[PDB]
Amino acid sequence: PHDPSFTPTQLAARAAYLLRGNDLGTMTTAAPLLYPHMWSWDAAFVAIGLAPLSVERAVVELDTLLSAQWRNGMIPHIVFANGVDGYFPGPARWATATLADNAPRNRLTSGITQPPVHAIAVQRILEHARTRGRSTRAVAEAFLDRRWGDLMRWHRWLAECRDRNERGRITLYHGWESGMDNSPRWDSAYANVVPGKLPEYQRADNVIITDPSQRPSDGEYDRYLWLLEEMKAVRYDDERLPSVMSFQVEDVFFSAIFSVACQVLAEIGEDYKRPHADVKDLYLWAERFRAGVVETTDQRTGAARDFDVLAEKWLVTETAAQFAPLLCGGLPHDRERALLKLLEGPRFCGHPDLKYGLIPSTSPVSRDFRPREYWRGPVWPVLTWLFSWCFARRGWAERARLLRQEGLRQASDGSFAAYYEPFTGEPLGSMQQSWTAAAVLDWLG
Amino acid sequence: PHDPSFTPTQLAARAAYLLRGNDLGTMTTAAPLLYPHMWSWDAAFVAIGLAPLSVERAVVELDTLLSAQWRNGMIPHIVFANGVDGYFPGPARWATATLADNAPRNRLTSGITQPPVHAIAVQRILEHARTRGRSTRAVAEAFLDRRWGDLMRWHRWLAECRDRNERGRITLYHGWESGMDNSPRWDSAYANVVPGKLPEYQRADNVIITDPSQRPSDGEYDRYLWLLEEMKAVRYDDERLPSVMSFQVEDVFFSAIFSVACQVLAEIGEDYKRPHADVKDLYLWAERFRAGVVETTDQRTGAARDFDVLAEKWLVTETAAQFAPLLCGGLPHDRERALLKLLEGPRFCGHPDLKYGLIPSTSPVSRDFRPREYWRGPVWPVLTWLFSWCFARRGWAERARLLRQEGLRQASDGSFAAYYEPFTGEPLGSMQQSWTAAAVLDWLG
Amino acid sequence: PHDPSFTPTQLAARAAYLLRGNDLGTMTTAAPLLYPHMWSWDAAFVAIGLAPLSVERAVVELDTLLSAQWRNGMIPHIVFANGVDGYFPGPARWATATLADNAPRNRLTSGITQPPVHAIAVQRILEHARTRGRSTRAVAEAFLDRRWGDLMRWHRWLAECRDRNERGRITLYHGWESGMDNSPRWDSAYANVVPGKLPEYQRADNVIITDPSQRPSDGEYDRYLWLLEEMKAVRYDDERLPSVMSFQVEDVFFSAIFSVACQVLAEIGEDYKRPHADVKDLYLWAERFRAGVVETTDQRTGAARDFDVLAEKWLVTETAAQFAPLLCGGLPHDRERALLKLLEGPRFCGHPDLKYGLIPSTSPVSRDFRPREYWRGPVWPVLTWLFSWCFARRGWAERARLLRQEGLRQASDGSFAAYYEPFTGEPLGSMQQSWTAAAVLDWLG
Amino acid sequence: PHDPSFTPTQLAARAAYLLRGNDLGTMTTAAPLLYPHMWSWDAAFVAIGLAPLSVERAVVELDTLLSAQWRNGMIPHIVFANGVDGYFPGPARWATATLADNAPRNRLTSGITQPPVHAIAVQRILEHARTRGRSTRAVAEAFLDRRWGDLMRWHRWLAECRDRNERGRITLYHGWESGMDNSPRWDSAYANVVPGKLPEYQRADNVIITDPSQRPSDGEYDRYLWLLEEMKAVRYDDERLPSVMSFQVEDVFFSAIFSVACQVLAEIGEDYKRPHADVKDLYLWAERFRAGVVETTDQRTGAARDFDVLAEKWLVTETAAQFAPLLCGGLPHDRERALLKLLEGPRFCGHPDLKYGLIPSTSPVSRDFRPREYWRGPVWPVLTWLFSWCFARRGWAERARLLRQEGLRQASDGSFAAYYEPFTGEPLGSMQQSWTAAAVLDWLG
Ligand SMILES: O=C(O)[C@@H](CO)O[C@H]1O[C@H](CO)[C@@H](O)[C@H](O)[C@H]1O
Ligand SMILES: O=C(O)[C@@H](CO)O[C@H]1O[C@H](CO)[C@@H](O)[C@H](O)[C@H]1O
Ligand SMILES: O=C(O)[C@@H](CO)O[C@H]1O[C@H](CO)[C@@H](O)[C@H](O)[C@H]1O
Ligand SMILES: O=C(O)[C@@H](CO)O[C@H]1O[C@H](CO)[C@@H](O)[C@H](O)[C@H]1O
Structure with a gap:
């Protein structure tokens, strides 16, 4: 009425209450109605948010995602909940259980991937578990025992099948794999996607989110859905995708996340006495992908660039993906200072009209x-x-703390939206978004 | 490891997470396994705990309890969840759906009552709703519209059928109705309960809580279960209970709670323009029960006494029920100071060995x-x-604040136990107790 | 910065820093440059803000003020710091050192009084001291032994010399004694003050606060200063002021405060075994001034009126002093509901343009x-x-909490201003005002 | 009281209150009675604790210390307050005013130095100042303009006059310069200090701290004071001390701090456009002292050793200074894991009897x-x-957070002691130690 913002304790309670209200039992939906299934990197963040509430339940979230891992190691970006419709494209559209030799048995999944933030989640679970004593550490250690192999096969599938030429960058076959469906990053690559005779369809996402301004366009979904046909045509075969996909891009943000993830998982590997060969491979991949990220960067500004493999050209766009090198490290000293100056200046966090x-x-x-x-x-x-x-x-303790502080100030309305209007702060997209509650729960301590 | 206590934000998140994890849909269990049904005054506290998280859901909790109200106005102390066993005595043992003419249709309930803290819950919901704006106030106001009549019939049934002689004290026919099953208050009244041929039974509560030190004795359950037979024999008829019950006590703590509750509900009645006759009746009952509580008190110490209606004598015991007059008011000035001195001295909060x-x-x-x-x-x-x-x-702002502070310090282990060892602080009884999470959620603000 | 507000720990730290910065050693200035002496009811709030920091230093503040008490029991509203200039009217202009038979012997002070909030500060000190252990309790109990007689003579002087006719309201001989110098309450009384040959003077207050819209006018100071001449002419003799003063009002807000103070001090007297005759007098005065406040009240809204003794008329103004009866109690239930409704509605707290x-x-x-x-x-x-x-x-726990929360939100800029623009929130008057820091500390310490 | 610990707001308030209480005007005493002057690295921590309270006053603290800098660039470890007695050795005993050609002209100071934590305080001031808006930024930037040259001469004096052979470690001529007077690090060096005819003296430190188990012995003071005689004999001449001093050690912890300080100050120089030649020198010294610290390290555990220059042997002791390499970096990955394992295991932080x-x-x-x-x-x-x-x-975000949390938990008694008994938590040394209040404020402000 005079202040509709919640106290930190109120905010934490409401966040935990949302997360439990989105739990179907062994998986957490990404959002109640818009995304009523398990999404891959959402589930990683959800496990980060559950770790303060229940190490056992946080571990279950990751167990459920890894139970859906493909035979080649790929973690698919959707794991469908049994019986739940209202999301398109659903399992019938992907038809992965029929066509994909590597698809898991008795799980319905999508046929593409999403960024590897999972190792970060494992770290947060371990750090929480160490503050909680003997029996809770045992839960988390038993999870490592049971899932270390699956995490390695995830990281190895990325390194070996999505970086076939050892370039230290991850190749994507769908904008959805980047996590940033309609980012300006992919516009020119999508402009070269000319769909054929696409089996007719009816969206579900913009029945729920009805503002057309907040979701992709019907022209954009036509390209998204045509890439699926191309994959279906080759039965989702890794070896055949390079030859048939109309969309092939190296995603520098995904690559930087993978480098961090390999570094995180290698350190976990050393602390918990995992095999030396695995730890050595993880450090190898972290350095390889650190270098591949740095190779994309503007020598002046340090801005990282995506690459259109088909058009054979650098994708120069002004998105937050430009700052990928700050995640993983590796820039020369002068170039990193310039990139931080870009991040803090009038073109991003320094823009005079931003609310936060x-x-x-x-x-x-x-x-x-x-x-x-x-x-x-x-x-x-x-x-x-x-x-x-x-x-x-x-x-960069003070930089991190400023982002956390502004993020809590933004979240403190309690909508738990997935995104916010940058000028007015209006919550947008789906409310009750699980990974926004998770961010809040992790920040509050 | 060095400090297993949670921060206030961690504690609030864990409390909200427990409350949602105990929600079956429209009702919240009192505790996961020991009490897997809706209990009456637990549900009031649960609604207090939900009010910071969701006014809509807090209101639903009370709606579900009031949907189980008996035709004469009595709120029964258990509302059984469909299909759930593992609590004895369950619905088959009470047989209320068969024998009780006033039992609700399509709800299975117990046949006795529990203290009227519900109006307090309504106040907390209204206070929360007023801080949240137009549409949330409308939810809470619509609840008053829909349930004011049911709350009145609850208060009127207590005033008219459990205080038949206008003594301003509530008569109980079972120790369970007091909320304090095995309190020393009822020992001498239970000593006069000589059970007949009691249909054989097997407990469930001490299979879950196995420490015999933490639950009543088999001799105590034999008396508890024999009172049920006596009620069943007269088909739970109010008019017939005075003539047949082996246990008839005036409960001064329950009486003081009823006085407060009438006062609270009368003020709500005025603020929301409820009928004048109801508001006048509520103020009448608050004063009547204030006076009945004061009439029990030691003229020196102010300690309130229970009354054994059958033995026709005051029950002098040294429990926290002695402090009933501090809840509702009405003592002379000198007598209240003496009672507060008792509360703070070596016999209660001042005892040198207490942890808190x-x-x-x-x-x-x-x-x-x-x-x-x-x-x-x-x-x-x-x-x-x-x-x-x-x-x-x-x-008594500072007194209240000291109790809240010590209660948070005690709760900060995160067990959410129903009771704690007074010397060592060891959590006892059931963990994951809904009303302990609710207390914490209400305190934290 | 996107938000200039401090966290609670930063704010508490900054408030304590301010309070110690204004400490001259044994007295705290009301503000660094505008008010560089000890003021009487500011010193009570300063004691309250000091008590979370140091019970010993809080006791010293009251000891210093009480060492300036007049021989008849009056606490003067200013205790000047030795050799400190920069405030007008200064010691020279009051001339109490040479003129007032009752002025203290080793202190320079003013010649008029201020509201008796002091017993409230004693309660807060005692409440902090009991949480701090035995040597701190002993400090607070020793202050009671040393100053109980002085606090009694303070209240007795008010009850006997400023309520000569036992009307249960306090008579003021200067608008400064109300604490609200230029309140609209006093305009019609001040219109009947006609200065004679007023010795020339130069203001100091508006040299420091230069914005003429934040301080009283020259015309108003002419009348404030003439009233000093009338008192000097009769050497501040209590007995002579009814016959010579051109300003005589009964202050209903001061009276309500005195009612509360009397009741608080009587309860202290009982807890700490002070003489029964003193406690009885305090309860007697508490009741008399409660009744006196209620006798002024409007029959429709419950609003309290001041009384112009010279003109024999009720002063009807729309200021916060109308809510005096909310402080001391006494109104019939129906009239206090009307008065609470006036406080919360669009004429005061509920005005739509107010920032807080x-x-x-x-x-x-x-x-x-x-x-x-x-x-x-x-x-x-x-x-x-x-x-x-x-x-x-x-x-009124929830009401008190809402005022505290809006007060903290307003204070969270860290200006610690004496007063704020009600629509824009602009800090006004002196920054670094000691009693504003003291409010914040009490609300948080 | 059942728990003597303060809430975070009370603690922050009490720490700020303490810091202002120790303020003499332009300098803050290190403690009220034990250390009633300005100490050099305490003054840096005081500046850090002041920065959440007042950037202007934090800048003043460093300005005052830097106004006592010697003509060769040395910052002396004590700046005496005018006319203040009660600490020994006092100005008279040092005789730098009459003997030291480089001592400042309008300040009395000691004749030895202390660790260069000052650039860390400048970073914290700058970080606070950027959150506070433009006039505060201008205060901090003006301090940089005024004192950048003085900070450069401070670091240059250390790099050139105390690392004459460019070994990348700092040579101390007195155990007091390490900040750890009686550390076991220096015992074997002090055993080779043989006092000649030492002028008689009377200690003042153990008059204030009387418990002889908390302070050094007379024997130890005999050696501390004789070293002053050796320096006086050569009039504190930099060039002559290698030839005359009976104490010459390379302090590896001081060296690591200097490495960090150099790197922090170089980054400040870049952000604020200070001369490139200065920034280059700072990065050069940061690298040199990093390498110098790593050269001392044990090949199995990574633990750093001090060097006795006179005896030409590594000093192997088990003190917190072994962890110097964790501060500045430089160790091979495998050796720093071993060193972290030593820090966390049963010999230091993980010892089973430690309270915190x-x-x-x-x-x-x-x-x-x-x-x-x-x-x-x-x-x-x-x-x-x-x-x-x-x-x-x-x-190491989680490691840093765990130290902060245990530090706050230990400080939550509000004693602000300089050091604590490791098993019982008993506060020791001087209470009201300014840098302990400053630690708490930074951790919370
Ligand atoms: O809009 C969609 O249909 C999906 C496509 O997978 O994408 C959005 O929702 C997911 C669940 O929150 C996130 O994982 C993505 O990052 C986000 O962009
Ligand atoms: O032990 C039992 O079987 C039941 C009997 O109704 O009693 C306990 O559990 C209830 C649920 O928490 C509380 O409502 C009671 O107050 C408490 O004493
Ligand atoms: O303006 C003045 O000269 C003085 C005269 O007493 O009055 C103002 O400052 C005082 C000190 O803060 C407050 O005690 C008053 O309430 C406030 O009105
Ligand atoms: O004991 C002393 O006389 C002095 C001599 O410098 O040393 C102690 O007190 C100083 C002021 O707090 C600290 O700077 C030191 O680190 C600490 O060891």
Whole structure:
């Protein structure tokens, strides 16, 4: 009435209450109605949010995701909950249980992947478990015992089948795999996707989120759904995808996340006496992908670039993905200072009209910028969380703390939206988004 | 490892997480396995705990309890969840759906009552709703519209059928109705309960809580279960119970709670323009029960006494029920100072061996005292909460704040036990007790 | 910075830092440059703010003020610091050292009084001291032994010399004694003050606060200063002031405070075994001034009126002093509901343009309202504190909490201003005002 | 009281109150009676604790200390307050005013130095100042303009005059310069100090701290004071001390601090456009002293050793200074894991008898350990702070957080003692130690 913002204790309670209310038993939905299934990197953040509440339940979330891992090691980006419709494309559309030789038995999953933040979740679970004593450490250690092999096969499938040429960058076959469906990053690559005779379909996402300004366009879904046909045509075979996919991009943000993830998992590997060969491979991949990320960077600004494998050209766009090198490290000293100056200046966190000192998903001074349209400009708490956590890991304590503080100030309305209008702070997209409650729960301590 | 206590934000999140994990949909269990149904005054406290998380869901909890109200107005102390066994005595044992003309249709309930803290819950819901704006106030106001009549019939059934002689004290026909099953208060009244040929039975409560020191004795359950037979024999008829029950006591703590509750509901009645006749009746009952409570008190110490209606004598015991007059008011000035001195001195909160400055359920210097045995000595957070809240209502801000502070310090292990050992602080009884999470959620703000 | 507000720990730290910065050694200035001496009711709030920091130093503050008490029991409203200039009217202009037979012998002070909030500060000191252990309890109990007689003579002087006709209201001979210099309450009384040959003077207050819209006018100071001449002419003789003073009002807000103070001090007397005859007198005065406040009240709204003794008429103004009866109690239930409704509705706390849900010194819909002008409209943290504390003592826990929370939100800029613009929140008057830091500390310490 | 610990707001308030109480105007005493002057590295921590309270006053603290800098760039370890007695050795005993050609002209100071934590305080001031807006930024930037040259001459004096052979370690001529007077690190060096005709003296430190188990022995003071005679004999001439001093050690902990300080100051120089030649020198010294620290390290555990220059041997002791390499970095990955394992295991933080998970000044399993005796065992909040801050800068967020939390839990008694008994938590040394209040404020402000 005079202040509709919640106290930190109220906010934490409401966040935990949302997370438990989205739990179907062994998996947590990403959002009640818009995303009523398990999503891959959402589940990682959800496990980060459960770790303060229940190490046992946080571990279960990851167990459920890994039970859906493909025979080649790929973690698919959706694990469908039994009987739940209302999300398109659903399991019938992917038809992975029919066509994919590597699809898991008695789980319905999608046929593409999503970024490897999972090792970060494992670290948070272990750090929480160490503060809780003997029996709770045993739960988390038993999880490592049971799942170390599966985490390795996840990291090895990325390194070996999505970086076939040892370039230290991850190749994607769908914008969905980047986590940033309609980012300006992929526009020119999608412009070259000319769909054929696409089996007719009817969206479900914009029945729930009805504002057209907040979701992709019907022209964009036509390209998204046509890439699926191309995959279905080759039965999702890794060896055949390079030859048939109309969309092939190296994703520098995904690559930087993978480098961090390998480094995190290698340190876990040493602390818990995992095999030396695995630890050595993880450090190898962390350095390889650190270097591949750095190779994309503007020698002046340090901004990281995506690469269109088909067009054979660098993708120059002004999104938060430019800051990938800050996550994983490796830039020369001068180039990193310039990139931090870009991050803090008028083109991103320093823009005079922003309500919060947070990272907009696209630069407000970019021609591509749209204040309400999903990844084309809104501020996403999940990015705030990932940048903050990675910055703290770099030693940039005060930078990390400013992002956390502004992110809590933004979240303190209690909507738990997935993204926010960068100028007015209006919550957008789905409310009750699980990974926004998780970010809040992890921040509050 | 060095400090297994949670931060206030961690504690609030864990409390909300427990409450949602105990929600079956429209009702919240009192504890996961020991009490897997809805209990009456537990549900009131649960609604207090839900009010910071969701006014809509808090209101639903009370709606579900009131849907189980009997035709004469009585709120029964258990509302059984469909299909759930593992609590004895269950619905088959009560047989209320068969024998009780006033039992509700399509709800299975017990046949006895429990204290009227419900109006207190309504106040907390309204106070929360007023801080949340237009649409949330409308939810809470619509609840008053829909349930004011049911709350009146609850209060009127207590005033008219459990105080038949207008003594301003509530008569009970079972120790369970007091909320304090095995309190020393009822020992001499139970000594006069000589059971007949009691249909054989097997407990469930001490299969779950296996420490015999923490639950009543088999001799005590034999008396508890024999009173049920006597009620069943007269088909739970109000008019016939005075003539047949082997246990008839006026409960001064219950009476004081009813006085407060009438006062609270009368003020709600005025603020929301309820009928004048109802408001006038509520103020009448609050004064009548204030006076009946005061009439029981030691003219020196102010300690309130229960009354054995059958033996026709005052029950002098040294439990926290002695402090009933502090809840509702009405003592002469000198007598209240003496009662507060008793509360703060070596016999209760001032006892030198207590871990926390909290109210033990029985005085540690009493011969009846048992440090682990349920209501014979342990510290109960639900009592801490009720005393604190009532003290604040009396204007005793600093007293209330000390109880809240010690109660949070006690709860900060995160067990959410129903009672604690008064000397060592060991959590006892059931963990994951819903009303202990609710107390914590209400305190933290 | 996107938000200039401090966290609770930063704010508490900054408030304590301020309070110690204003410490001259044995007295705390009311503000660094505007008020560089000890003021009487500021010193009580300073003692309250010191008590979470140091019971010993809080006791010293009251000891110093009480060492300046007059021989007849009056506590003067200013105790000047040795050799300190920069405030007018200074010691020279009051001439109490050469003229007042009752002025203290080794202290320079003013010649008029101020509200008796002192017993409230003694209660807060005692409440802190009991949480701090035995040597701290002993410090507080030794202050009681040393000063109980002085506090009694303070209250007795008010009850006997400023309520000569036992009307249960306090007579003021200067608007400064009300604590609200330029309140609209006193305009019609001040219109009947006609200065004679007033010795020339130069103001110092508006040299420091230069914005003329925040301080009284020259015309108003002409009358304030002439009243000093009338008192000097009769050498501050208690007996002669009814016959010579051109200003004589019964202050209903001062009277209500005295009622509370008497009741608080009587309860201290009982707890600490002070003479029964003293406690009885205090309870007698508490009741008399409660009744005296209620006799002024409007029959429809319960609003309290001041009385102009010279003109024999009730003073009807729309200022925060109308809510005096909420402080001391006494109104019939129906009239206090009306008065609470006036406090919360659109004329005070509920006015739609107010930035904070707080009590403006004058109603914004009154013709007397000026948003910048001292006591004619601005919101004063010190009044928020006093109403919050009195409301909690009435048992209005939620009301007291809402005032505290809005008070903290307003104070969270760290300006510690004496008063604030009610619509914009602009800090006004002196920054670094000791009693505003003291309010914040009590609300948080 | 059942728990003597303060809430975070009360603690922050009490720490700020203390810091202002020790303020003499332009300098803060290190403690009220034991150390009633300005100490050099205490003044840096005081600046850090002042920065959340007042950037202007924090800048003044450093300005005052830097106004006492010698003409050759040395910052002396004591700046005496005018006319203040009560500490020995006082200005008379040092005789720097009459003897030291480089002593400042309008300040009385000591003749030896102390660790260069000052650049860390400048970073904290700058970090606070950027959150506070433009006039505060301008205050901090103007301090940089005024004092950048003085900070450069401070670091240059250390790099050139105390590392004459460019070994990348700092040479001390007095155990007091290490900040750890009686550390076991220096015992074998002090055994080779043989006093000649030492002018008689009377201690003042153990008049204030009377418990002889908390301070050094007379024998130890005999050697501390004789070293002053050796320096006086050559008039504190930098060039002559290698030839005359009976004490010459390379302090590896001081060296690591200087490495960090150089790196922090170089980053400030870049951000604020200071001369490139200065920034290059700072990065050069940061690398040189990093390498110099790593060259001392044990090949199995990574533990750093001090060097006795006169005897030409590594000093192997088990004190917190072994963990110097954790501060500045430089160790091979495998050796730093071993060193972290030593820090956390049963010889330091993981010792089973420690009350708090904190770093004892000497390992409890060492033969040199004394639980009460100054730097021979007690836990010092100031070291907790420095390790926590350095650990966060390394990117060890969770490690830094655990030290902070245990540090706050230990400080929550409000004693603000300089050091604590490691097993019982008893506060020791001087209460009201300014740098302990400063640690708490930084951890909370
Ligand atoms: O819009 C969609 O259909 C899906 C496609 O997988 O994408 C969005 O929702 C997911 C669940 O929150 C997130 O994992 C993505 O990052 C986000 O962009
Ligand atoms: O032990 C039992 O079987 C039941 C009998 O109804 O009693 C206990 O559990 C209830 C649920 O928590 C509480 O309502 C009671 O107050 C408490 O004493
Ligand atoms: O303006 C003045 O000269 C003085 C005269 O007493 O009055 C103001 O300052 C005092 C000190 O803070 C307060 O005690 C008053 O309430 C406030 O009105
Ligand atoms: O004991 C002394 O006389 C002095 C000599 O410098 O040393 C102690 O006190 C100083 C001021 O707090 C600290 O700076 C030191 O680190 C600490 O060891």
